[PDB]
Amino acid sequence: AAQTNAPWGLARISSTSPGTSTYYYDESAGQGSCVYVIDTGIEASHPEFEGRAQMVKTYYYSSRDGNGHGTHCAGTVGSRTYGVAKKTQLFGVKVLDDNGSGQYSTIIAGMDFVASDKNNRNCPKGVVASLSLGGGYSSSVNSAAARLQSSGVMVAVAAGNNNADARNYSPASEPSVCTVGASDRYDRRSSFSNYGSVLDIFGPGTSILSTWIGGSTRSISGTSMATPHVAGLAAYLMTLGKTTAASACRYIADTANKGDLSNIPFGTVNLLAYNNYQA
């Protein structure tokens, strides 16, 4: 399949070169996979989800995404214009309030919920979790993500927007999850993107157009935007049987475009998420 006029990030993970506009992907498009979007929630009613999104848990008075951030990242995962895996299942886990913030104890609880709730879902191709969040280093937030990962969920986390080494940030610094950095449309490291040795992969993260609350769209930026690209990629590749929940990060790093990225500080991997689609 081929999406013409795709967002630059979708066309980026389907090409070895920047500047294209067509997103080439396999027609399976992540069908049979589930991606938990651990964020401010999802506006499941957004027509770009076509009823493949639903809120499964909230930690606040409402399950509504009164912020937009969770609706945006779920959009990059599997919305049908702005999503990587345009046929996947989207489960909203609202651990962030409508200010895009939330306590560590709430984030940990949301990760432990996803670890258990997935045993109630129908995800024959595997379970992915997209974590567009992250404060400072926490051994507890780190080990919650590791728990979620070892429970059989491919965990993708944002490196953080602090232009620093990600080892001082959670769940970014947890070794066993997929720590995603951000890049821009000219294959530069995003100006805000965290780096370091804990990073596993870079995704399109600057000026990412995707769904927004109120049936709208919005272009924003952050490693929080690069994470859904990788989560959707993992979900898409798991549907194809190319990898597993436990291997998907290594596979995406093995099959990534190596060396294409500028301003990659010495010691940080130079890998751009790439789906290696051939027709």
Side-chain angles (χ1 to χ4, degrees):
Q3 165 175 29
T4 50
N5 285 355
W8 81 261
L10 296 185
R12 202 34 197 108
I13 66 155
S14 91
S15 155
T16 62
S17 156
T20 84
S21 95
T22 309
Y23 172 36
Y24 309 97
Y25 63 103
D26 182 271
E27 228 171 70
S28 74
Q31 174 66 273
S33 64
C34 309
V35 182
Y36 285 80
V37 180
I38 313 202
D39 223 341
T40 71
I42 311 181
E43 193 171 83
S45 78
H46 197 303
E48 278 285 334
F49 297 125
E50 299 137 346
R52 288 178 287 106
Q54 60 169 296
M55 291 291 309
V56 301
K57 181 75 165 156
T58 186
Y59 288 84
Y60 304 90
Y61 51 78
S62 81
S63 274
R64 291 211 116 172
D65 184 13
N67 181 280
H69 199 130
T71 301
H72 190 272
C73 298
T76 302
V77 171
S79 95
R80 227 198 173 173
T81 307
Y82 320 100
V84 172
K86 310 172 171 304
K87 254 93 171 51
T88 200
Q89 255 286 349
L90 296 168
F91 297 128
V93 175
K94 181 170 175 57
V95 299
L96 309 185
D97 63 357
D98 299 332
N99 285 337
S101 82
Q103 319 277 20
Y104 283 167
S105 67
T106 298
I107 285 183
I108 291 158
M111 285 192 267
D112 282 321
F113 168 87
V114 171
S116 162
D117 171 83
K118 73 159 198 297
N119 302 332
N120 308 339
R121 303 309 163 162
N122 224 303
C123 320
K125 295 295 177 277
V127 182
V128 180
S130 206
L131 281 92
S132 291
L133 47 88
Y137 180 88
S138 153
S139 169
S140 285
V141 177
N142 266 27
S143 98
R147 270 199 310 278
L148 181 55
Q149 172 72 53
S150 100
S151 99
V153 177
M154 193 277 175
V155 178
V157 302
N161 318 309
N162 319 94
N163 186 40
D165 199 309
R167 54 150 158 48
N168 299 81
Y169 296 96
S170 278
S173 34
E174 161 57 37
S176 68
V177 303
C178 214
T179 301
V180 190
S183 70
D184 66 38
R185 75 172 65 242
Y186 307 111
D187 285 355
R188 298 182 290 232
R189 173 174 70 91
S190 290
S191 47
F192 48 78
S193 176
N194 277 354
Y195 50 88
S197 80
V198 74
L199 260 80
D200 308 305
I201 192 82
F202 282 85
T206 299
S207 299
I208 299 313
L209 171 75
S210 174
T211 51
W212 201 250
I213 56 163
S216 63
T217 75
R218 195 167 295 204
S219 165
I220 63 201
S221 34
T223 47
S224 267
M225 302 334 131
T227 302
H229 284 102
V230 155
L233 178 52
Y236 158 90
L237 295 172
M238 280 146 83
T239 282
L240 288 184
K242 302 221 172 316
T243 183
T244 56
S247 325
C249 191
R250 200 180 297 177
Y251 182 82
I252 285 166
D254 293 323
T255 65
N257 286 308
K258 58 88 142 191
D260 300 9
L261 285 206
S262 281
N263 204 25
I264 300 304
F266 188 91
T268 304
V269 303
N270 199 311
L271 302 156
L272 196 39
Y274 173 56
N275 73 349
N276 192 32
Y277 180 61
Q278 325 274 5

